[PDB]
Design a protein around this nucleic acid. Sequence first.
RNA 1: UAAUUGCGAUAACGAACGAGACCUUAACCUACUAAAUAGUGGUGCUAGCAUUUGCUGGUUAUCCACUUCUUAGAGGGACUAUCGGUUUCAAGCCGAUGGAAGUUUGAGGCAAUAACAGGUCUGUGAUGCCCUUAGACGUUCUGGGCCGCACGCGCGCUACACUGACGGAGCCAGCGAGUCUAACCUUGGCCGAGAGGUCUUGGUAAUCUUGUGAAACUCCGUCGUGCUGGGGAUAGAGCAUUGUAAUUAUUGCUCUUCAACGAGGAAUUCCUAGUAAGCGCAAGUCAUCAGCUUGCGUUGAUUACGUCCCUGCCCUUUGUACACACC
Lengths: 143, 141, 157, 112, 67, 145, 100, 53, 70
Amino acid sequence: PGVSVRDVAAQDFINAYASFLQRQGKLEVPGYVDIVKTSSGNEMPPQDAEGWFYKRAASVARHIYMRKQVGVGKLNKLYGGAKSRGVRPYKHIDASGSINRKVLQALEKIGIVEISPKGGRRISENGQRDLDRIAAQTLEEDE
Amino acid sequence: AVPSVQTFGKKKSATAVAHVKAGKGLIKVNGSPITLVEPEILRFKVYEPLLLVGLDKFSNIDIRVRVTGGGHVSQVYAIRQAIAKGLVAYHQKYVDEQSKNELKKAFTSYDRTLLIADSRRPEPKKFGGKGARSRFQKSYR
Amino acid sequence: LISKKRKLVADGVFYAELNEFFTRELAEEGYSGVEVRVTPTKTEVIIRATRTQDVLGENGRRINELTLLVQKRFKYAPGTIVLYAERVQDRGLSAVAQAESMKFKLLNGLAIRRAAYGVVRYVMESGAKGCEVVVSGKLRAARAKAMKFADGFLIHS
Amino acid sequence: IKHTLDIINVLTDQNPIQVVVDAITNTGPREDTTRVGGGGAARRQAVDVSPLRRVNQAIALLTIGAREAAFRNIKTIAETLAEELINAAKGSSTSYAIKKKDELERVAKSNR
Amino acid sequence: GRVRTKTVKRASKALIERYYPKLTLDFQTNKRLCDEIATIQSKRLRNKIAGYTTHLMKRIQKGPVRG
Amino acid sequence: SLVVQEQGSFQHILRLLNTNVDGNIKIVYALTTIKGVGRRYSNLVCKKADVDLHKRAGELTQEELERIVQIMQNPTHYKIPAWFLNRQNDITDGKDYHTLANNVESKLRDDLERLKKIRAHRGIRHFWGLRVRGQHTKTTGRRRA
Amino acid sequence: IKIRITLTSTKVKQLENVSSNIVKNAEQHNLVKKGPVRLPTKVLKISTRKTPNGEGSKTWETYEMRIHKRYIDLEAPVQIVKRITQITIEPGVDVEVVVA
Amino acid sequence: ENVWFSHPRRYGKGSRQCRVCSSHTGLIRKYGLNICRQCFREKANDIGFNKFR
Amino acid sequence: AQHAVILDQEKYDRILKEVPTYRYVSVSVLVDRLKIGGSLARIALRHLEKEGIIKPISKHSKQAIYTRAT
RNA sequence: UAAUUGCGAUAACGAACGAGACCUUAACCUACUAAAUAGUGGUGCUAGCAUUUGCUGGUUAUCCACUUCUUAGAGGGACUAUCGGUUUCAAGCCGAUGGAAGUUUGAGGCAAUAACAGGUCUGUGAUGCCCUUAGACGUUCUGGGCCGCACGCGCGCUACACUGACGGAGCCAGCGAGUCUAACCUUGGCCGAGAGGUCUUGGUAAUCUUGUGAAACUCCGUCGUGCUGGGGAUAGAGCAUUGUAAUUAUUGCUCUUCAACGAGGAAUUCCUAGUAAGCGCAAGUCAUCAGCUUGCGUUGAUUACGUCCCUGCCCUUUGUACACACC
Ligand SMILES: [Mg+2]
Ligand SMILES: [Mg+2]
Ligand SMILES: [Mg+2]
Ligand SMILES: [Mg+2]
Ligand SMILES: [Mg+2]
Ligand SMILES: [Mg+2]
Ligand SMILES: [Mg+2]
Ligand SMILES: [Mg+2]
Ligand SMILES: [Mg+2]
Ligand SMILES: [Mg+2]
Ligand SMILES: [Mg+2]
Ligand SMILES: [Mg+2]
Ligand SMILES: [Mg+2]
Ligand SMILES: [Mg+2]
Ligand SMILES: [Mg+2]
Ligand SMILES: [Mg+2]
Ligand SMILES: [Mg+2]
Ligand SMILES: [Mg+2]
Ligand SMILES: [Zn+2]
């Protein structure tokens, strides 16, 4: 009957595609991984130390699949959160731009996304086909 | 052409627009199936339009809902209202009045907000206090 | 190249400044208001007053100097701004004209009650439904107070 | 609430909704007292309680007991509400709401 | 409260005094004739006047009314 | 889902950098008790020392603890990016340090003493016992001592 | 020819009668037109303290100016274009005509 | 002298004033009107700002 | 409170002998009746579910509900 | 009756102001007029997964059609309608039904007479008198101060943790504002842990920023009753941005330091439903700086549906040695 990413729940799809990318092992994880926090509004680095870049990659790949074209500033706003400003009230703070820009470049190098006209990154046809194949596998795993 | 109706449901700022056409039984919300609506503690709140009348009513039609505005729970309420109103409007236009009245009676007997929008609106905030009613703290000394 | 919000606020403040200028200089001419009409290639300023002959002067000399004044101040090109004078009707039904006439009577030395009853009688004779004039301040004493003079009926809310 | 009903059905094989309504019926306070003038000193006069107030005050006592016993505790709020409703449904007197109801009725009986 | 003021009451009595056989015991028709037979500046005030007129017609049908 | 049987090799109190580091708590939040070692620095040092971060502090090997303290004492050698360091571009040597257990109080005393001996306004403020960061002192900090 | 006429007043009735006589002149001349698109009314608010000094109850006061905007698309030759831009002059109604 | 009035008035309250009364304080700068709040309450009806709600 | 944070032989065979005869098993149940930490309780819950001694009822985060398997 | 709102009574009759009416706003309209600056469907072109035909998308010069959703203009609609109780059986009130809506439908705006020796001469080129007026109390320049800290008060903000913190995911608003002789709101690309830098771009704006992808919230984990991974005051070091200038730290960022606080005594504030409370956002101020304010939406309870006990207010009667009037 055919499936797509929209037929699969977001969490288990993202987990399955992140595990697939980690097993494939050609994503070029930048190297300052295990140093950084992913946001100025965060206070601790990601707890899943050896992963989390495949998680962010699967998340941004699925996000670009659903949208038309997404850029780094939209990604920074999407992943930014409430910063605790000590004794002053909380506030929305954008996430790290270097992490999102490098994961966009990594997805471009493995061929999932591409540069779009009207700016930003849109999903490529290869990205569409293998995200759809991952959706098929993770919807079949329960059978 | 294909028999079809368009309806909507509302709750606060959330609006859901539903296209109900003749089909084979797919219920989609924002392009995803009805079984993936985000607060799963509230998933039965959009299941209950289907459940009160039975799925045989939905076997021969298919419904696509796009919801915007508001927040998470209000979008859930707008989705259920749009789906129920779409089924009633389809049975009004292309099926008979007996079936339309039975659907309307079942939905009304369970929950009036399945068909009639909740009319509660925000009250504007007034100066001299944080909210519409609440005032700043008064001190005397 | 200006936004519509700023343009409409700007011509509102232009109207307010022009009205203040005209009520500052044309007080003894019975100046009763101003109206502005923008037109392709020309904007026209209609002064509504009582003594149009004093507003104009000989061959409209005061009109020419008023056009030149508003031109020099508001940076208009030659020919783009034009002023007309117009005799207002129903002078009794003009609160600004009545207030200015009462002001000049009090400055000349009329008694307060005589001036106020003159203006209320003139307004009531002019066909108004009601008139009310209030004079506040140091009236015949160092302690200030307020005097009210009314005729007819007036609503408030 | 969903977790609480699951825990109730696990701990006792009863219908958890039946356990909830038994808790409410058992811990509604049947007589109370109200303040009067009393000539410059507070006196309390025993009065009866309407059934709607019994339901309201039963719910308030049950949830206040659960919230207080869950505060600063390894037990979760769902667990604390589960044993609160179970003990109130038994009338076991280890329930906060049962003890509060008994204390209020005893004070009213003294102040008849 | 739903107490109607003397403008509504006086207009209703005048309307009944000079238009009794023309107007009916139904609010919709009383509204539709009141808007053309009287000059009322507000739709709300016209509705209130027509409603009190209909109420007084029911009163008149159940025996005579003083005033 | 993985339970393990620990033996008698667990220790409850262990001694690093003249500090009684408690066992029984996980290694990064255990190492935060060393003064000059916070949560970010301890997390990064444990990652660079390649220990299981899930492990409690008391059940780690002596070589693992020595590797941890060696990395803490020389962070720039083990590729700590130098903006983690709490004493960088220091006023005397010019090099980036990360002060540790007693050195943090020693260097704080050094900094305050330098400010006092040149009679800078911050040093005079520290000598008096007042707030030095420009806060209003009219209403707060009344029982500050 | 692709002309667009934009009307941006604060006076609703004068705006509507200017729009009405433009569109009836267009249908009298049998010109194909996109009808008067009415943009969202933009409300300009200014909130101030009522008092000139600063004592008493803190009473606030919001003033607002409402801007109403409409536009009509016309496909008409140039002589009717000049006659349209020469007719329909109204005080308080700001009219502008643009081509292409 | 060139020392007179030499201090910059490019930003802050010393750069702006009420266009009516030349007051530095209480200025409303919204929509570029630059009128102090008291003068604005006097001339709001002339400008076009009205009270409705 | 001095809840055990690593487990040894007596704690292991104790939990293996009396996580049965518990009607309701959860993190706080294990913490209260066996004096182990919450982390050991979560690990032990997953382990006992994987062998199958306790049967899950609902397996939410922040609240785990297990019964005995018979 | 919310109301000197009315039914009525009646040495008064007829009126006027206030109240109400009114006006603005929020709710309804598959009825009208329309829309390439709002959307939807179909047809072109095209991607992926499937296999007759399907599903999810991309592309507006690719055209056509429509107006449900959106925006206005013009209108309609509620008048307590109908029915049943109750009341001299009048004005009205109570319940149920229908209805988008039935506490004057909700919220405002406007708002009388008489007054206070209320506040304001530091908003005003509004002002009388008094003072000063050239080593001026005018004005400008430089540097300080308005922030100074033994203490005592009033608004508030963060919290004392598991109904939580942290980490990954999920992922949704409404009100608004924005650059011309200027340099505003800024997408996208690149560099940087970050703050930020840089190259461009769209937008004088229902078009662009902006779906303002907000936060609380959800879901999986980590922690685990330990002032603890609660809390983040006070400090140290370094990197940036605004600005002529940041030293008494302008703010932002990074690492380190890690204090009180274990739910708060007498007292005392506010509040009746989309309200309280939680949660953030825009705007004002504004070169930079929100723990403030004015609005806006998101999540959404409990408990009244009363009374005159306290504190007050209105009307009538009554007493008074009060009239600057019980201070
Ligand atoms: Mg997040
Ligand atoms: Mg908070
Ligand atoms: Mg609130
Ligand atoms: Mg607890
Ligand atoms: Mg298409
Ligand atoms: Mg009746
Ligand atoms: Mg009202
Ligand atoms: Mg003054
Ligand atoms: Mg000050
Ligand atoms: Mg205050
Ligand atoms: Mg913390
Ligand atoms: Mg979280
Ligand atoms: Mg929006
Ligand atoms: Mg400042
Ligand atoms: Mg601000
Ligand atoms: Mg302020
Ligand atoms: Mg006596
Ligand atoms: Mg006396
Ligand atoms: Zn001014």
